[PDB]
UniProtKB/TrEMBL annotation, chain C:
Belongs to the glycosyl hydrolase 15 family. Residues 10-117 form the CBM20 domain. It comes from the Eukaryota. The chain holds residues 499 to 615 of 616 of the full protein. Glycans are attached at residue 37. It comes from Penicillium oxalicum (strain 114-2 / CGMCC 5302) (Penicillium decumbens). This is Glucoamylase. Disulfide bonds join 9-106.
């Protein structure tokens, strides 16, 4: 495995930087510090920035920057991290279909346009994990800055951003939202778990800076209390509080543990540590659910690595293995191995008995120290099993090293979005854990006491527009075919009227009222009769004419009066191009 | 030292049992399970039961009962503990000058009569440490019962009592009250520290029983936050929130650490563990404050044990060494020694530097493992220093083994109350720690995280009269000279009128209006115009006549009309003898 | 903050008011006084002792206080607290007499924070 991990590891770091706005070669017109999810523009279109993908990848690069094996430009990496932080200052102020910064709701928006404008269309919103992952990425870089004498930089630029995200989590954790696959509307294990961690970490940074974080003081025990409801007795039910019906067997559960891994923590069931009996039992159930149903898993018995997906009921693009799933499966095992090595022992219990019997059919319930025959046999066997997952990825990685979103359940051909940022991140992170490189401890050993009774009392936050940003020389790879522009219109309507825009270019339908671009009413209110559209497929420099109309509920087309409006799409590095318009009578 | 610890240790266990109502030979007319503070009846009169003395002594006997060296009747000890628990069920319902059970306020009353009646006179009330110490004693016996299959006994008899005390602490911790010496009205280190511990322990028992304790969930971090205000930078200021002015150097601070000692905890400054730099620095300051001022400390230099008192400004009975102070001084050191031995190391820091320089003038700041030359030198020297305190007690213990409250600053003669229950308890507890016998861990390692900001939000409790009690064969040592009777009177008055009672026996003044017994107005209200008196020096069986009168604000004596009222003091084992009276017109 | 000035004061002579603050829990009808060995404190005559006010006595702080005014600058004195019980009895605090020395020159809020001696 060793040469392939070196080769694909260099390739994976390159794949991340290529997708980072500023200098990334595959990000034309993207603002500095914004990660694209993939350079795919069509079938599917992933040429946007997601708060989740971007925060998980930032965490990956920050850990890399302070600890790792192959050639690395530290200066280039720190500038990218700084540009990431600056870009997020700006996005926190953007009003969007989830809401505004004023009351916090805007912060739960899943994705944005590459030029810092909001996305207008319908989507699985809100996704409440986002602020939590971003605070965790940011606190991690902040603790590095404090260590190297730059504490004034942390309090001036970084604390204003982190305080908004911590406040969001303190206020909204006990509301439903969409899961990380953007499909199921309810309460998600992964989301609650990362929310719990983010607040605990906020507390620690707040004390280093001499600041308050009331949310960080009051909420963590009650978030932990709720997180216990996901354990069903046999595995982790991934979504609850929902009308949805699937089994709940889902990678979501494995990712929750992976991304709340604490190297200094014991095998704690309360916080679901990777070496905990709950996480191991869930691992077996998760993996086994794919053995039967993918043709490329034929003959791969219990005790052997298999190719795994999001959830067994999945039909998205056929319902296939995901590279980040197969890699995540290994990473949970590598985390477990590290913890047992640190502790000097492992425990086999009733809950974990089936997991361990896949490596030793003989095994009995008991405690086993580092010296013992069972400890050696189980750990050496679990190690080979974990490597087996990386071996399957090796069989199915193309010669050019590209990691797509998916590989095919029947043929293993790569498919869906190419060069998925999070796929590359997932490779580095799994292979780091195999080599015993682990991130800073988040303090799980002091955030594991479950209350006597669950009783939720979230706190309303105070939110303030960030103002300061880091100084950087980064500009952007010039814009080409995609320059998203946002059009804001004031127009009072009656129930059943819908507002559209038309114009003399392809993205506006070339004056065909059947092909006009719809405006959303998500921010229409008695206080501001507002409609808006974000039109994306407009090349840099395009001059165009446009005009608003309504589709009346009888089918009639009612055009605004007056002359056509004119606009010129910018060139180079566009920042929130838009027009504020009032209906022409 | 060894023979004296065996001899005085047997004597001390005997001294405790002698003072325990039920079978204790020095407790005539005292109800089963009530500890008297001392058999002294005059100069001073300590023939009452205090919630503090009784709870600290119960903790001592419970620890003894599950772990200790000399002859011990375990059956006799368990019955006494059971009788203690039952007696406290009854007392929680007694209305008194601090208030009623209905709103919790009654629970802060410092002392009661030996026959379960309230004490009527003015006193340093409330003392808010009481409920906390009783809950801690009780939870400790409860965890023993659960271990030996008697969990239904814990939930039926014990939880109702403990829930009232935990609720009291959750509601009233952020109010002022009198300190443990019954003098200073403010906020006391000892009181906050034991309040913090009691709630943490309640949480653990509540989960074992499947019960709620909302107070135990919400309050501990904010109690811990407030406890940080007692550290002044050099020592622990014993009382704050007060008009009082003393230095704040006081045994109170040492007792706070001793009685929140956790053998499984590290040298934590946040919870002031005995081996913490804060507790050691305070130890030196506390001890040094007495070296100059007591004549019996002449020539006892730094590095040698000295005789110590309550606080350096003390004038009570002359202001003298207390046996429990001298012993407490040693116990803090023995606790420190145990913790360093468990951890494998000790640390010398700037805060602790003066403490350690008394045993090694050379010592430098650093960390020192068990193997090192400094660790051996410091620990062997600290050990001899601690023993030096027990050696001074040996010089000043009488041949009959009696431990009074005090011994004289000039002559070392024993004085004030003889056979102080808490003095005997303090001997067992210090000598146990010397022999490395330690109590169950209370979980300080999971209750040491200080919030980002202090912001108090106590919760209003729900209080319910306990009903169930343990079955016992214990009765009492028959009543002799002291049978306290309570007289409750309904009588409406105008401002300046005071109610008294007179009668034909010595305790009622033999019909002399100058010598009548005053009734208190502490429970007089627009809703119940109530006055009451608890008259104590009435021998068993006494028949008497009595009559109420007022001293008018002009000096006139106004007698109630009608015939004299008649009463007969009971014999044997009196339970709350009293009369409910209405003014005779 | 205050303004900077060179002003001091005309030195004190016959009137140096001192405030005595005492913590002491009582029952209804008890009044606290102070006595001592100078004229303003009544020369140990319990009929002539100085009364303390209960205006700031509360369940939260059992506080009594007196401001005694006709005490010349520099006077050294002994004092002791007592209660007049509602039956007329005089109950003295125990322990030694407390000692104080009235300041000279320009006194700023001379006072004593005291706790009843048992
Ligand atoms: C907001 O927080 C509260 C309190 O943690 C959450 O309420 C709890 O939700 C869980 C899961 O639905 C409930 O558990 C269920 O209880 C039923 C009935 O006993 C049982 O049959 C199920 O198997 C499951 O255990 C739990 O009772 C409930 N606790 C309460 C109300 O105190 C709530 O779900 C959270 N909501 C969101 C949107 O975050
Ligand atoms: C009830 O709980 C609150 C909150 O813990 C307590 O308030 C805090 O009291 C302390 C001690 O008096 C205050 O500290 C002091 O602050 C001043 C001014 O900055 C400083 O000069 C002193 O040396 C000392 O540090 C602290 O500020 C205060 N915190 C608040 C109000 O948030 C309160 O004392 C508790 N009361 C009782 C009766 O338990
Ligand atoms: C690297 O290899 C990948 C996978 O083989 C290539 O991606 C495919 O490119 C072909 C070209 O016609 C398309 O038909 C497929 O749809 C692509 N797959 C996916 C998942 O998008 C990729 O083109 C190669 N990269 C370079 C730079 O040559
Ligand atoms: C045990 O010894 C103590 C102390 O010497 C005795 O207590 C003293 O008794 C004398 C007897 O007249 C009194 O003057 C003292 O006031 C007592 N001291 C105190 C502190 O109370 C005690 O009497 C002896 N006990 C027995 C049972 O003989
Ligand atoms: C669309 O309108 C713009 C602005 O009037 C004009 O310059 C441009 O040539 C037009 N483009 C077409 C017809 O494609
Ligand atoms: C006091 O009164 C009682 C009841 O009338 C009477 O029996 C008793 O002898 C009297 N005691 C005296 C005068 O000591
Ligand atoms: C009063 O007491 C003080 C202090 O003890 C003493 O110095 C002074 O002489 C006394 N004054 C009298 C008796 O006038």
């Amino acid at each position: 495995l060793t040469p392939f991990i070196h080769k694909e590891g260099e390739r994976s770091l390159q794949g991340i930087l290529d997708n980072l706005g500023g200098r990334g070669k595959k990000t034309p017109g993207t603002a500095a510090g914004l990660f694209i999810a993939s350079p795919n523009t069509e079938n599917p279109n992933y040429y946007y920035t997601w708060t989740r993908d971007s925060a998980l990848t930032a965490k990956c690069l920050i850990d890399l920057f302070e600890d790792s094996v192959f050639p690395i430009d530290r200066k280039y990496l720190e500038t990218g991290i700084r540009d990431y932080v600056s870009s997020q200052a700006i996005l926190q102020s953007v009003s969007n279909p989830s809401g505004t910064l004023k009351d916090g709701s805007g912060l739960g928006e899943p994705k944005f346009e590459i030029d810092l404008n909001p996305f207008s269309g319908a989507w699985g919103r809100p996704q409440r994990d986002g602020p939590a992952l971003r605070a965790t990425a940011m606190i991690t870089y902040a603790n590095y800055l404090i260590s190297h004498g730059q504490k004034s930089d942390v309090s001036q630029v970084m604390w204003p951003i982190i305080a908004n995200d911590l406040a969001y989590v303190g206020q909204y954790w006990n509301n439903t939202g969409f899961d990380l696959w953007e499909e199921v509307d309810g309460s998600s294990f992964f989301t609650i778990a990362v929310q719990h961690r983010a607040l605990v970490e906020g507390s620690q940074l707040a004390k280093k800076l001499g600041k308050s974080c009331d949310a960080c003081d009051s909420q963590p025990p009650q978030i932990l209390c709720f997180l216990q409801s996901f354990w069903n007795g046999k595995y982790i039910t991934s979504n609850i509080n929902t009308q949805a019906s699937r089994s709940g067997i889902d990678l979501d559960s494995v990712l929750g543990s992976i991304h709340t891994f604490d190297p200094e923590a014991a095998c704690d069931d309360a916080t679901f540590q990777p070496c905990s009996a709950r996480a191991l039992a869930n691992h077996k159930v998760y993996v086994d659910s794919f053995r039967s149903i993918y043709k490329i898993n034929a003959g791969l018995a219990e005790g052997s690595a298999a190719n795994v997906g999001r959830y067994p009921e999945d039909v998205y693009q056929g319902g296939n293995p995901w590279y980040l799933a197969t890699l995540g499966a290994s990473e949970l095992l590598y985390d477990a191995l590290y913890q047992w090595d640190r502790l000097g022992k492992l425990e086999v219990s009733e809950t974990s008995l089936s997991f361990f019997k896949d490596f030793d059919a003989t095994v009995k319930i008991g405690s086993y120290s580092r010296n013992s025959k069972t400890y050696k046999k189980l750990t050496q066997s679990i190690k080979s099993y974990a490597d087996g997952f990386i071996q399957l990825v090796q069989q199915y990685t193309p010669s050019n090293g590209s990691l797509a979103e998916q590989y095919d359940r029947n043929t293993a051909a790569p498919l869906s979005a190419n060069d998925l940022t999070w796929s590359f991140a997932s490779f580095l992170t799994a292979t780091q854990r195999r080599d015993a490189v682990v991130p800073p401890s988040w303090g799980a050993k002091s955030a594991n006491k479950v209350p006597t009774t669950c009783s939720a009392s979230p706190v309303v936050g105070t939110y303030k527009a960030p103002t300061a940003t880091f100084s950087s020389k980064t500009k952007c790879v010039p814009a080409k075919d995609i320059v998203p522009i946002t059009f804001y219109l004031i127009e009072n309507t009656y129930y059943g009227e819908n507002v559209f825009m038309s114009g003399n270019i392809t993205a506006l339908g070339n004056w065909d009222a059947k092909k006009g671009f719809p405006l959303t009413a998500n921010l229409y209110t008695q206080d501001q009769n507002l409609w808006f559209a974000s039109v994306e497929f407009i090349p840099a420099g395009t001059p165009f004419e446009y005009k608003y109309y309504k589709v009346e509920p009888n089918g009639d087309i009612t055009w605004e009066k007056g002359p056509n409006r004119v606009f010129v799409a910018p060139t180079g590095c566009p920042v929130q191009p838009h027009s504020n318009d009032v209906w022409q009578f």
